[PDB]
Amino acid sequence: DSLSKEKLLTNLKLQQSLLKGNKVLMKVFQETVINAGLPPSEFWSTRIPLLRAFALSTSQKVGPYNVLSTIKPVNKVNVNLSREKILNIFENYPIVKKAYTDNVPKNFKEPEFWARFFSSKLFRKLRGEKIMQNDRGDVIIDRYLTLDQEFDRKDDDMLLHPVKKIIDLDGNIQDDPVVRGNRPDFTMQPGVDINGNSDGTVDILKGMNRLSEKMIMALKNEYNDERNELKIDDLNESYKTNYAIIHLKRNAHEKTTLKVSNQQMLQQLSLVMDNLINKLDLNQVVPNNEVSNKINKRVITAIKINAKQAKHNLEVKSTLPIDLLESCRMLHTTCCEFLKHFYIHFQSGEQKQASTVKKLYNHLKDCIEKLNELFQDVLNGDGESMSNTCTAYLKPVLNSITLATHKYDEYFNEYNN
């Protein structure tokens, strides 16, 4: 289905779809392929989960439901039609879909059609309403009555299937074919009208049963056992988890990249217990104001250093021209994209990736030179008034990029040389 990497890369229409959904994706994609000419497959190669998420979001569909039961008759009536529910009616009733498609594009209008439909007795029959000759219906819609009837016959023919004997009431009533007793009660048998004909409640009940069967066979779509069926689980062994416990052997390496004696510590301990029982003065704790002054110097130096650390506690406010700010952000963004793709190629590790690595290396070099030329532009645009800040802002991505270039050169010298 539409789930492989190849399928997701193939769906150019879906790619354009979420493209048109976003705006920064036009920005990024335009710079990536329109401006830089990157292979758009490798563009989308990162965004594969996003593509699949968009596809699966677009791909779901609802389940069937009794749309005619949700239809209410609502003096006068005003049509308040919902197109999704109109198509729901179409899908649930292909007869109604057919009656739409041979009349509205031929004879009259859609709201006129639906007014005729709500007027029609075919609507009442398809809904849970007993048909009545007092009702006149709509003649145009009610011409489809026998067509819907033979649809019902064909659908019932499709719905017929053999039954399991374990639950077969037909086999149950065919237990004794020579039962000769008495005629059962009118009360518990299906009653009829005065002239022997039925009222049709059996028809409406078999119709709603047909609706149920249609729903369950819609469930039963494309998208022996009695031994298991008759198991009595209540007298069986309880399930126990096979979860594995874990122990932990403990032997850690010592931290890598004079010794005191009991006599000496005991001597000092005796002496300091003597001093402890001897004396203790709070007033002697006051310092000499000179080594204390050096303490003041050290403390104040620490305060100054950490205060300058705290002095640099939406992005930050900047005094850049807004266009050059956007341009440099754009260049940073596409350089980051190039760098990520180059790392994807490099950490892949194949000889098939070699020309890709070389070409992305060329693109990184081009981005470097374009960064330098941008630096020349902000040079002769500022006289290095804040072109220094421009260079420093674009610095770290450039450092990482050129570090990657050095890594590529080093591995080239490692393998080839």
Residues 54-83 touching other proteins, rule: CB under 8 A, are: 56-57, 60-66, 69-70
Given a contact cutoff of 8 angstroms between Cβ atoms, the answer to whether 140 and 104 are in contact is no
CA gap 97, 86 in Å, rounded: 9
CA gap 211, 216 in Å, rounded: 9
CA gap 417, 409 in Å, rounded: 10
Within positions 83 to 142, which residues make up the interface with other proteins, using CB under 8 A? 128
Q: How many residues bind other proteins (CB under 8 A)?
A: 150
Within positions 138 to 167, which residues make up the interface with other proteins, using CB under 8 A? 159-161, 163-164, 167
The region of 10-18, 131-139, 147-155, 342-350 touching other proteins under the rule CB under 8 A is: 342-350
CA dihedral 224, 227, 229, 230 (to 10 degrees): 150
Structure tokens belonging to residue 59: 């791909």
The region of 11-19, 98-106, 277-285, 368-376 touching other proteins under the rule CB under 8 A is: 277-285
CA gap 234, 225 in Å, rounded: 19
Q: How far is the CB of 185 from other proteins (least distance, A)?
A: 5
Q: How far is the CB of 104 from other proteins (least distance, A)?
A: 27
Length of the chain: 417
The region of 97-105, 114-122, 143-151, 400-408 touching other proteins under the rule CB under 8 A is: 400-408
**Does 385 engage in binding with other proteins (CB under 8 A)?**
no
DSSP helix/strand/coil, 412: helix
**Does 405 engage in binding with other proteins (CB under 8 A)?**
no
**Does 291 engage in binding with other proteins (CB under 8 A)?**
yes
CA gap 291, 158 in Å, rounded: 103
The contact mask relative to other proteins for 197-216 (x = CB under 8 A, - = no) is -----x--xx-xx--xx-xx
Which of 75, 243, 322, 380: binder of other proteins (CB under 8 A)? 243
Nearer to other proteins, 147 or 305 (CB): 305
CA gap 389, 260 in Å, rounded: 57
DSSP 183: P
Given a contact cutoff of 8 angstroms between Cβ atoms, the answer to whether 345 and 360 are in contact is yes
Structure tokens belonging to residue 142: 């009610």
Q: How far is the CB of 125 from other proteins (least distance, A)?
A: 15
Nearer to other proteins, 60 or 197 (CB): 60
CA 57, 58, 59, 63 torsion: positive or negative? Answer: positive
**Does 223 engage in binding with other proteins (CB under 8 A)?**
yes
Nearer to other proteins, 106 or 248 (CB): 248
Q: Which residue has the tokens 């204390």?
A: 292
Nearer to other proteins, 98 or 359 (CB): 359
Q: How far is the CB of 106 from other proteins (least distance, A)?
A: 33
CA gap 20, 26 in Å, rounded: 8
Q: How far is the CB of 69 from other proteins (least distance, A)?
A: 4
Nearer to other proteins, 24 or 105 (CB): 24
Which of 134, 146, 228, 309: binder of other proteins (CB under 8 A)? 309
DSSP 168: -
